Amino acid sequence: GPLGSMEDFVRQCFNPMIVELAEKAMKEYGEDPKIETNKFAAICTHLEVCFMYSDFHFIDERGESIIVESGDPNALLKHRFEIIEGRDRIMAWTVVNSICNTTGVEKPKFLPDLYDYKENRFIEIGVTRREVHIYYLEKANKIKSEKTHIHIFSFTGEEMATKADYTLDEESRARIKTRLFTIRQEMASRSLWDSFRQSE
Numbered sequence: 001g002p003l004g005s006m007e008d009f010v011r012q013c014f015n016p017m018i019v020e021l022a023e024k025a026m027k028e029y030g031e032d033p034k035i036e037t038n039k040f041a042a043i044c045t046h047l048e049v050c051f052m053y054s055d056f057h058f059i060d061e062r063g064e065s066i067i068v069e070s071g072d073p074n075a076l077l078k079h080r081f082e083i084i085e086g087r088d089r090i091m092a093w094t095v096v097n098s099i100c101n102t103t104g105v106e107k108p109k110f111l112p113d114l115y116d117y118k119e120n121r122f123i124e125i126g127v128t129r130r131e132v133h134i135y136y137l138e139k140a141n142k143i144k145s146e147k148t149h150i151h152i153f154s155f156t157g158e159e160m161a162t163k164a165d166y167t168l169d170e171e172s173r174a175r176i177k178t179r180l181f182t183i184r185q186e187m188a189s190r191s192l193w194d195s196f197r198q199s200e
């Protein structure tokens with residue numbers, strides 16, 4: 001039917017915290033969310049995936065990996081992931097250096113998205129409107145010598161991850177995929193999707 005505004009969609013369908021972090025990210029790099037609107041939506045989408053990836057995952061009081069969906073994360077539990085994406089450059093490198101100097105893991109060349117304290121590795125999260133294998137390769141090309149694990153989601157439910165190691169259980173990955181499908185369906189109802197797919 002009528003064509004919506006991608007700005008309206010972003011502000012309506014993403015949490016304000018996410019929108020704000022994305023606006024700040026874009027300003028930091030000199031890009032205007034009112035102009036690069038498809039990019040704004042992609043940035044919000046990727047941030048949300050990063051948050052959803054780490055949601056509910058802890059390392060227990062005996063120090064192994066568990067899921068707690070209660071809003072009461074009893075205080076002896078360690079969050080399983082450190083989130084790097086969404087931080088400004090200075091803070092992001094501060095966090096990365098701290099992890100590296102601590103855990104002994106090697107320092108990445110570019111900022112990754114997450115650190116996994118269970119698997120003891122950085123993770124790069126991809127979100128793509130294209131074939132996952134193509135985007136996997138591109139990401140890998142920048143990471144090169146790689147201790148950094150890559151995990152790619154598409155909007156159609158396909159995934160590709162380093163060494164066929166998917167890190168998370170099926171239910172967690174299913175939440176992310178359901179959210180991506182919902183984003184695509186909603187863009188489509190506002191006639192925003194075609195343009196957004198093509199602009200990656």
Ligand SMILES: O=c1[nH]c2cc(-c3ccc(F)cc3)ccc2cc1O
Pocket residue numbers: 025026027028029030031043046085112113125126127
């Ligand atoms: O980890 C990722 N980070 C990204 C960051 C951007 C980005 C591009 C321009 C900006 F002004 C701000 C952010 C665009 C795309 C990505 C894709 C990623 O996987």
Ligand SMILES: [Mn+2]
Pocket residue numbers: 085111112113
């Ligand atoms: Mn990133």
Ligand SMILES: [Mn+2]
Pocket residue numbers: 046113124125126127
């Ligand atoms: Mn990423």
